[PDB]
Write a protein that binds this ligand. Sequence first.
Ligand code: 1XE
Lengths: 180, 4
Amino acid sequence: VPSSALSEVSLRLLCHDDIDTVKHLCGDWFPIEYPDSWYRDITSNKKFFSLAATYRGAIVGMIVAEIKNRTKIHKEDGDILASNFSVDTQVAYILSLGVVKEFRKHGIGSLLLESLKDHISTTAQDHCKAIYLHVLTTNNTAINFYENRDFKQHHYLPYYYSIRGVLKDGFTYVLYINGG
Amino acid sequence: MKAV
Ligand SMILES: *[C@H](O)CS/C=C/NC(=O)CCNC(=O)[C@H](O)C(C)(C)COP(=O)(O)OP(=O)(O)OCc1oc(-n2cnc3c(N)ncnc32)c(O)c1OP(=O)(O)O
């Protein structure tokens, strides 16, 4: 892909009509079988920030996140706000982040992440205090991306993922924002 | 990448 590609990249929210494209792209990006009800949810439910990067019409990347109250964090990560005592504290969970292979290393993943931060700053500037995500422990490309962007490793999650019939370990990564 |  041309090194001027980032300049031609646009952004838009996912919609219902994107389901088939999103399912196909996810099939390539993530070795995980998400059900059709999930694709329906992330393309329609306004509780999600589901953002696509597009190039000459077509989706070449996406980030899907949910801003939610601290009480909605699952037990395995219940301690990411252990030093924060405010009941109004929110967090943003990144459910999915991916970029088409040929378009990687052009800044699109960075743009998607930055756009989530901008959305948080615009929509939940006071209360959202962290961004967190899960990643396969073997996913060095993603781990380097996050660690170079101030995310810190927080939990080791043994056999967290089911990957084509076999269990695999995960990490939780966390970035504190607006003071934590 | 959320788990299922
Ligand atoms: C749950 O979904 C969270 S965990 C799963 C993450 N997603 C995947 O594993 C799917 C497959 N992997 C990907 O889609 C991408 O590798 C991700 C999304 C991880 C990164 O996307 P992208 O490659 O678009 O990110 P980036 O902004 O371009 O940064 C990587 C990177 O590139 C360079 N780099 C080299 N040359 C350039 C130029 N000219 N311009 C910008 N960037 C360039 C870096 O220095 C990068 O960052 P680094 O810090 O080295 O990792």
